[PDB]
Ligand binder design. Structure first.
Ligand SMILES: NC(=O)c1ccc[n+]([C@@H]2O[C@H](COP(=O)([O-])OP(=O)(O)OC[C@H]3O[C@@H](n4cnc5c(N)ncnc54)[C@H](OP(=O)(O)O)[C@@H]3O)[C@@H](O)[C@H]2O)c1
Ligand SMILES: NC(=O)c1ccc[n+]([C@@H]2O[C@H](COP(=O)([O-])OP(=O)(O)OC[C@H]3O[C@@H](n4cnc5c(N)ncnc54)[C@H](OP(=O)(O)O)[C@@H]3O)[C@@H](O)[C@H]2O)c1
Ligand SMILES: [Zn+2]
Ligand SMILES: [Zn+2]
Ligand SMILES: [Zn+2]
Ligand SMILES: [Zn+2]
Lengths: 360, 360
């Protein structure tokens, strides 16, 4: 029906026909004291959107609305709301959508690591409702996880930051990325590029680390201080020995990644932080003998604090990421999904034209 | 013959008979401009002394004088010596004995991680001579790697800190071991014991992590603010979820770290540092999302700068490690290698009584 009782969206109907989501109406989650309703206007197509829909993460209950780099207008506020969020405001919602908000980790700005963590879609809340929203007309989210979008960031350029961006930003900040450091980006995909830009915006000397040579010209155009092509090096660890302070791995998979070499290019005390979550059938493998004075670790999304910090940065040092736009709808999400599989993205897809697709 | 012509120690003869080191004389390494000669007066038994003799590091060119926790007085100073070391001065030498002292890692106090790194024993120098010293009347080391043992530290207690000690000290100071911070030591062995102490010494709430409760009492005696039993407490990472900032492991190895549990006990940002040395080819496989907000790596000895700090620390806060001495001689050694390869050590042996064993 309409916005209050039913939500509509382009939802995955089966993990086999994942490339052909169908428009669907579905019950919103129950509305809670702090939840907020957002009418979407733009959403970013994230690699996770794919892994999930393709069933790479396990059998997900269907139907399923994906997409978690949401930008839209506040349309209704929860009873016990409190955060200046005002109906009509252009806000954003990323990958996380809930946290206990009371444990130390939460109060210490580490809600991505909260015990009661809940992702935007494909997860059941305590009430049992499995998070939806994203490629839809409305999303229902607890206010703590809704951020304001700096007035000067085009929606189609703000959206991706909400997850792909925040995902590189959190590890970068936390691990010293900034003036005078030598940062490295593995995998120039959707996150990688944002991670390259954001890298520079923070002040470091960034190295893009890809396997083929295709993305070279593009990397420099983003401000890369240098480019490396694994397949063309034979042992870049050996060659770039003792150069990197921090390296963030943003690959969609870890199969074409040598964690037995990477350490060499790491300065004493350097740190390797992987950001990826590959198919359920993959491990992070390496001969430990190399983690000599080098630390390897995995990182989740970022804190909402960091998320606002990023939004501030992109807004201030005026960051313009690489996005292509497609209209929400079965045909658009199809092309989006299709191309993401083909890796045929000039980095980021942002579904738009939400109002001329969902009507009432 | 004697000191100038050639030394003599309790050398090993074969990786097989490694438990029966026969006394042997050998030509000292060349005496370069900046080297120094030390008539050892005390030495500590390091686990690695065993590991090397047993051949866990591969087949070594025989014979071989192990031991690299050397304590002794200065005999001669190379023609260009400029450390400020006086002859007869009480100094010490540990696991490292050389570094290019010209590379960045060096001018930045990271000698252990230097390219031209050379260990105290069983390794050829730039010139080919295989490093000796240790369980002998003397040892010829580059002055740079000679530290002035503090006047108030009984030489049978100073020695262990040269290696063992320093090995845990570094990981601790480099990872912020101190007031507030909650340190966790895994493996109440030799290195593990000096760790618990130094940890408390440095002002950090310390937990000792062993599987059994055997050493449970000793731990509390050394200052441990708490004790944990691996096998005994089942899922300790759960019980102690989100507590440790740092954990320096000293057990069997890094690939024995049940990451399906240990990480759990690490607070977001936590560091698991192994101090054991992995096989150049051991390969580790943890979930891509296993080290969630937890890093993992290993450390090697420490810089002399740190080595001195440790000494200064031990001197001032006056710490006494749990040492048991033995006669520096074929007989003694056997008792040591024999009780080391068993754990029948009250943490650290110190082969003393040099003067009354080598004569001339
Ligand atoms: N922890 C978190 O909070 C979080 C949040 C969001 C996403 N993620 C993870 O981030 C990934 C999403 O990727 P994305 O959306 O940023 O980018 P994407 O547009 O999917 O591109 C991924 C890029 O990584 C590289 N890649 C793909 N397959 C690879 C393989 N087999 N071996 C080595 N490199 C490969 C490619 O770059 P090159 O060809 O240039 O090497 C590719 O362009 C997923 O794995 C997801 O689980 C984690
Ligand atoms: N990187 C460096 O600079 C450096 C310098 C010196 C030494 N090291 C390394 O440090 C180790 C030397 O040990 P150490 O001399 O300090 O002590 P040690 O007296 O040899 O005792 C080692 C202790 O670790 C634990 N352990 C032994 N086998 C184990 C196993 N299979 N699984 C789990 N835990 C086990 C035991 O403690 P619990 O029974 O209480 O658990 C044992 O008492 C070697 O592995 C060496 O390579 C590295
Ligand atoms: Zn929480
Ligand atoms: Zn994402
Ligand atoms: Zn040692
Ligand atoms: Zn050097």
């Amino acid at each position: 029906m309409s916005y209050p009782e039913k939500f509509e969206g382009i939802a995955i109907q089966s993990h086999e026909d994942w490339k052909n989501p169908k428009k669907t109406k579905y019950d919103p989650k129950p509305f809670y004291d702090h939840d907020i309703d957002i009418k979407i206007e733009a959403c970013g197509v994230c690699g996770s959107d794919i892994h999930c829909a393709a069933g790479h993460w396990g059998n997900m209950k269907m139907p399923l609305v994906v997409g978690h780099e949401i930008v839209g207008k506040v349309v209704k506020l929860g009873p016990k709301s409190n955060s200046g969020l005002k109906v009509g405001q252009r806000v954003g919602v990323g990958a996380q959508v809930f946290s206990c908000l009371e444990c130390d980790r939460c109060k210490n700005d580490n809600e991505p690591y909260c015990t009661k963590f809940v992702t935007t879609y494909s997860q059941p809340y305590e009430d049992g409702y499995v998070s939806q929203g994203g490629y839809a007309n409305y999303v229902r989210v607890h206010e703590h996880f809704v951020v304001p979008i700096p007035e000067n960031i085009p929606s189609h350029l703000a959206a991706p930051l909400l997850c792909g961006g925040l995902t590189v930003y959190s590890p970068l900040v936390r691990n010293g990325c900034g003036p005078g450091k030598k940062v490295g980006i593995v995998g120039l995909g959707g996150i990688g590029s944002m991670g390259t830009l954001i890298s520079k915006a923070m002040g470091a000397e960034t190295y893009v680390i890809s396997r083929s040579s295709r993305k070279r010209e593009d990397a420099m155009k983003m401000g890369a201080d240098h480019y490396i092509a694994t397949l063309e090096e034979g042992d870049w660890g050996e060659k770039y020995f003792d150069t990197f302070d921090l390296i963030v791995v943003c690959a969609s998979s870890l199969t074409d990644i040598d964690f037995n070499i990477m350490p060499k290019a790491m300065k004493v005390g350097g740190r390797i932080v992987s950001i990826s979550i590959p198919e359920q059938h993959e491990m992070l493998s390496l001969k430990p003998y190399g983690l000599k004075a080098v630390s390897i670790s995995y990182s989740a999304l970022g804190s909402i604090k960091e998320l606002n910090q990023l939004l501030k940065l992109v807004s201030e040092k005026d960051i313009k990421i690489w996005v292509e736009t497609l209209p929400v709808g079965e045909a658009g999400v199809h092309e989006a999904f299709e191309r993401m599989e083909k890796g045929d993205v000039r980095y980021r897809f942002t579904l738009v034209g939400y109002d001329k697709e969902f009507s009432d």
